[PDB]
From a paper:
Recent research has identified the Mpr1/Pad1 N-terminal (MPN) domain-containing protein (MPND) as a sensor protein that may recognize DNA 6mA modification in eukaryotes. Moreover, the Mpr1/Pad1 N-terminal (MPN) domain-containing protein (MPND) was the first reported protein containing the RAMA domain to directly bind to DNA with the 6mA modification in vitro. In this work, we investigated the first crystal structures of the apo–MPND and the MPND–DNA complex from Mus musculus at the atomic resolution. Our results revealed that MPND possesses multiple functions, such as binding DNA and interacting with histones.
We used different MPND truncations with dsDNA to generate stable complexes for crystal screening and, fortunately, obtained the complex crystal for the fragment (residues 54–163). The complex was refined to 2.47 Å in the space group P1, with an Rwork of 24.5% and an Rfree of 25.4%. The final refined complex structure contained four MPND molecules, as well as one dsDNA in the asymmetric unit. However, as the DNA recognition by MPND appeared to be sequence-independent, and the DNA bases were averaged in the structure determination, the final nucleic acid density could only correspond to 10 base pairs. Therefore, we modeled the adenine and thymine into the electron density. Among the four MPND molecules solved in the asymmetric unit, only two MPND molecules were involved in direct contact with dsDNA. The primary protein–DNA interactions between MPND and dsDNA were the hydrogen bonds formed between Ser113, Ser115, Trp135, and the DNA backbone. However, no specific protein–base interaction was found. When compared with the apo–MPND structure, the orientation of the N-terminal loop changed upon binding to dsDNA, and R63 moved over the major groove of dsDNA. The overall conformation of MPND between the apo- and DNA-bound forms was found to be similar, as demonstrated by the structural superposition, with the RMSD of all Cα atoms being just 0.8 Å.
Author numbering:
A (entry chain C), D (entry chain A): 63 to 131, 134 to 156
B (entry chain D), C (entry chain B): 62 to 157
DNA sequence: AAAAAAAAAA
DNA sequence: TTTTTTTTTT
């Protein structure tokens, strides 16, 4: 039963909002809005992403195109999404 | 593919950055903010920087009514006396 | 949820299997069929097997009248002198 | 506009009838009646299914309960339903 | 009719 | 992990 941002928002481990997702890589700050459907809006361009890993690999490739590869890079209100994946596996 | 943000509204030149251009009117209270080129907002009173219209709106309204719950603050924020949500609507039509 | 078939009629014991039990009378001509426990029909003349009373009814009527167009054969088929459609109605009554 | 047995029947790709739909799985032969509304009646039990997939997963789970999973399994007068799906996409 | 939740497969 | 598409539900 693979864990998605949709499960988390539904099972209330997360709350949707503007500029609640962030990535720091080699000096560039990326900020993301979380929609109720769990899709991510990159503020800078408004381009929509389906998964943390989609958004993270797009952003990191802009800074270092050699970077081949989500839940460890993307933070939600100061904490990594993995801790929110973990939290859910413990509740369910 | 693409959703509206303050930064998308700045790139399409639908909005212009500057001092006191943003405003909220809530229960006889007026809050004014500055719009930055990077789409972030500065609340004039504290000089505090917010990352969203929501985040600034939820914060200001919490100071006048402490039982004010979180939600989308595009509906309550004006740019030069007109509703942000109209700039969103203008962009959505502009780019069908 | 549920709809009538020869097999549902067999389960509810509304029909008994056997030789010669089925019959069609079309333009002064008679055809007879055996009803199997699996609900398939055997045409006595050729020993040919059909999935439904329809399939059998259109095949037999097309030999006496090559125009006759396809459709539901329940209306035309008799089980021991009574219309198969009466066994359908008697089942629907019992169940609903 | 996703293709259903109703569309095929309505657009005359399929003809409704008794014992016109069939499945063969591990020795069990299943036979279906196609209704004008595009719903499937399973001859053996008279139980009514809304989709080829609903009928196929039900019948097969009876043979092999570890089979989790329509248009490839269910045949119409000797050919697979997917061929009638493909035919409609060309005709429309 | 739309809106949203699910089994392989790379 | 994610990316895919039919179907049930309304």
């Amino acid at each position: 039963r693979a864990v998605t941002l949709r499960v988390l928002l539904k099972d209330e481990l997360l709350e949707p909002g503007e500029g609640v997702l962030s990535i720091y890589y080699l000096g560039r700050k990326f900020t993301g809005d979380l929609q109720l459907d769990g899709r991510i809006v990159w503020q800078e361009t408004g381009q929509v992403f389906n998964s943390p890993s989609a958004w993270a690999t797009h952003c990191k490739k802009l800074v270092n195109p050699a970077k081949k590869s989500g839940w460890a890079s993307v933070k939600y209100k100061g904490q990594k999404l993995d801790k929110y994946k973990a939290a859910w596996l413990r509740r369910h």
